[PDB]
């Protein structure tokens, strides 16, 4: 769930969780049709990831627990300790998204905006 995501982000990033919480359209795990930029595009593929997790594997990504290891390298962030498909899958959705966040750049003006844009 989002507590693990939030920690994965902290594992790799100094940017306070607030700044992601309502930013853009999709951040975090909210639905829409057109993403505002690259960061919002991360959440999209993440939201897209949960929705596949739910529909194909029967995961409850917003409720379920999973574990992960924070390592020295963001890349080395590890999900292999998980003992089920669902815990494995959703851990990876969150790993993918936190890495993507590192590529993307953050425009404070796309943060907590007017619903009309999405």
């Amino acid at each position: 769930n989002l507590n693990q995501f939030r920690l994965m982000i902290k594992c790799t990033n100094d940017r306070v969780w607030a700044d992601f919480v309502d930013y853009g359209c999709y951040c975090v795990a909210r639905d829409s049709n057109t993403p505002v930029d690259d960061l919002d595009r991360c959440c999209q593929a993440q939201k897209q990831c949960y929705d596949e997790a739910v529909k194909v594997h029967g995961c409850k990504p917003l409720v379920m627990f999973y574990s992960f290891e924070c390592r020295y390298l963001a890349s080395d962030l590890d999900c292999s300790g998980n003992n089920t498909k669902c815990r494995n899958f959703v851990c990876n959705c969150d790993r993918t998204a936190t890495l993507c966040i590192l590529t993307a750049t953050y425009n404070r003006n796309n943060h907590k905006i007017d619903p009309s844009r999405c």
Partner: peptide
């Protein structure tokens, strides 16, 4: 109960057994 099943039981099991 859904939280026990989805999050709390696994988290506690993990923390005890594996962390």
């Amino acid at each position: 109960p859904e939280q026990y099943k989805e999050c709390a039981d696994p988290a506690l099991d993990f923390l005890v057994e594996k962390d």
